[model samples]
Target chain A: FVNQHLCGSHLVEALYLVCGERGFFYTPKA
Target chain B: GIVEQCCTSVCSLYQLENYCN
Candidate 1:
């Protein structure tokens, strides 16, 4: 599953969620 | 911002581990 197309999703999610918990990295589209 | 991208890449690639550190 590592090479899955959704890999970016995993990263973006962690970047948003984990970084959100850190402070602010939750930028996203509308 | 761009910093977030660095952190995300570091995280995803498991390079530096705790990315933003």
Candidate 2:
């Protein structure tokens, strides 16, 4: 979803995925 | 490295989009 709309590169998408897992964004920690 | 560059670019893009909303 994010990639289709925002990210123009696979590397960018991958970066989001990796950073996202590291609590980079505010999403209520699990 | 390249990964950090991509991360920064995406982060900036996300910030830009977030500001638009």
Best candidate (score: DockQ): 1
Clashing pairs in 2: none
- Candidate 1 displacement at residue B10 in angstroms: 9.1
Q: lDDT tens string, model 1, B1-21?
A: 333434333333332124433
TM-score of each: 0.29, 0.28
Badly placed stretches (over 4 Å) of model 2 are: A1-8, A21-30, B3-21
Per-residue C-alpha lDDT of model 1 across residues A1-30, encoded as one tens digit per residue: 222222245645544554444543333331
Provide chain B TM-scores across all predictions.
0.19, 0.29
Model 1, residue B15: distance off in Å is 6.4
Q: Candidate 2 residues A1-30, lDDT tens each?
A: 333323335544544565554433321111
